[PDB]
Amino acid sequence: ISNEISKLDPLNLDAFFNQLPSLNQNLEVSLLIDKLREITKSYLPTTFSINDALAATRDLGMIMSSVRKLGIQPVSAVSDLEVFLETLSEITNMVPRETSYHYGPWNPIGERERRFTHFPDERGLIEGVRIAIPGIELAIREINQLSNLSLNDPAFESLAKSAALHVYQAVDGIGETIKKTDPYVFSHELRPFFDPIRIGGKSYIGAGGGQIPLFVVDVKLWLGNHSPNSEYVSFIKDSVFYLPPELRPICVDSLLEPSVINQKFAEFGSVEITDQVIKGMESLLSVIQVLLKFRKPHFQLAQRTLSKENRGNYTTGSAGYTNSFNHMVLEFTIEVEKQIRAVLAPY
Ligand code: HEM
Ligand SMILES: NCCc1c[nH]c2ccccc12
Structure with a gap:
């Protein structure tokens, strides 16, 4: 595509x-x-x-x-x-x-690459989302297939392993940003190119890292319909119609259904707990741990560029949130790692 x-x-x-x-x-x-x-x-x-x-x-x-x-x-x-x-x-x-789709995967490699500035730090944003997005899209389709497999089926474990490996592309992508984009250059030179634009009576935020469909992974995988009034569900609600249309039904269905992990916690404490079943429950933990490998350094990056020293004229990302939103998604994900670890503790 x-x-x-x-x-x-x-x-x-x-x-x-x-x-x-x-x-x-x-x-x-x-x-x-x-x-x-x-x-x-x-x-x-x-x-x-x-x-x-x-x-x-x-x-x-x-x-x-x-x-x-x-x-x-x-x-x-x-x-x-x-x-x-x-x-x-x-x-x-x-x-x-x-959006980040146009700025990353749809943005050509090499001499035709569209850039706002001459700063090499801008390459770190572009390559970040260009790497992350196809990997997350692959994990989306694989994780969607887990609702329909059994913890004891080896096809569950291998599919969740494929998803974890694809989510790693988001780790590879944020690591390219961290090594190429100076926080001070970002806030002062690049960040202003991502401000909202008024089009037909509505305001549209600029391209933003949060527009990679990682939140779609989250909703299917752990958030589901379990925290209706969260600020995260408000951000997802504001994001649905920015996604490519191909991704919208998966997101809406998942916001209205129990998450994979919630429904797999039920299957776990209800079926004969075999060795493949524990491998299956551990393939979910692996995926969650890959999101942490993305979210922990991402949080440090946003903290460094939003510090009083480096932040310039902004206190928010292009979507209008501070790093507290990032802390909130990261604490959610940690809470889920802790939850799976307890279900697995006797085994
Ligand atoms: C210097 C570079 C960056 C800074 C300062 C930064 C900061 C932020 C901020 C402030 C938010 C809150 C939402 C908003 O208000 O826009 C956010 C959300 C987010 N950004 Fe970044 N970001 C940077 C680069 C990236 C890159 C390159 C990616 C993807 C490769 C990315 C992925 C995300 C994601 C996935 C979220 C949603 C929160 C989550 O799922 O954990 N960011 N970021
Ligand atoms: N993750 C949101 C930070 C951000 C603002 N403008 C961007 C451009 C490309 C990648 C990330 C960003």
Whole structure:
């Protein structure tokens, strides 16, 4: 899917994107606005295939975010953008704005890579979500298959092992950020390109790491329908319709059903506890421990860049939360590791 979108240049902006970091560095807003005006007049978006509309949203969204970076609402300044983005989102059935999908897996590798700035630290955000997202999508489909297998079936253990290995891509992705993105450069140079944009009477947050579908893993795997009034369920609720449409039913079904681990805690204290059953209960613990290998260093990274020393003009991520939200998801995940460890303790 992604290589078919990353290869596209539907708005002929390849040469423009090799100038964009210098345009942004010199605050050349007139060339940004002019490029947005040329686009609405040069192109009939109703004629676009789905793949073209996804890549077009990627490219147009990034010029929009460069204008919003300066403090200007780009659709209030180029009012013809509105029906253009309207038309694009009817084709994508997605928000009229770029997300981490467009910035990561749909963003081409190499010389055509779309970047806001010349800073090498920006490569650490892009590669982070470009690595994490396909792996999480694989784990989503594998974890979804566990509701329908028995703890005693070896196919359960091997599928949950496949999921843990795929979730590791999120660890590989955040480790690329930690080693490439300076916290101070992030807050001062990159973070401003991810601010909300008003489009047809609604505000759309900018691309954000939290838009990788890790929360979909969580809802199916451990959260389920067990904490209705949580702030995490509020963030997931706000996130559903940012996901690719392909992922929305899994998320909605899982928010309305018991989680895998809740329903596997029942099976465990109800069936004959064999050796493969314990392997099955331990394959769930392994997956949870991989999310911790992502969430613990992620928390340290966000703490360092949101410190009084490094934070710049922001106290929040692009989704509007402080690191307390990250602490809250991390404590949830630790509580679940502790829960599985107790169920396994006699064995
Ligand atoms: C310097 C870089 C980064 C900083 C300062 C940062 C900070 C934050 C903040 C403040 C939040 C709270 C939600 C919000 O308000 O947007 C958040 C959420 C989140 N971000 Fe990051 N982030 C960074 C890079 C990344 C990267 C590269 C990824 C993916 C590879 C990522 C994945 C996530 C996830 C999954 C969440 C949801 C919470 C969770 O599931 O644990 N972040 N991040
Ligand atoms: N995880 C949210 C931090 C963030 C803000 N802008 C980004 C761009 C790419 C990756 C992460 C971010």
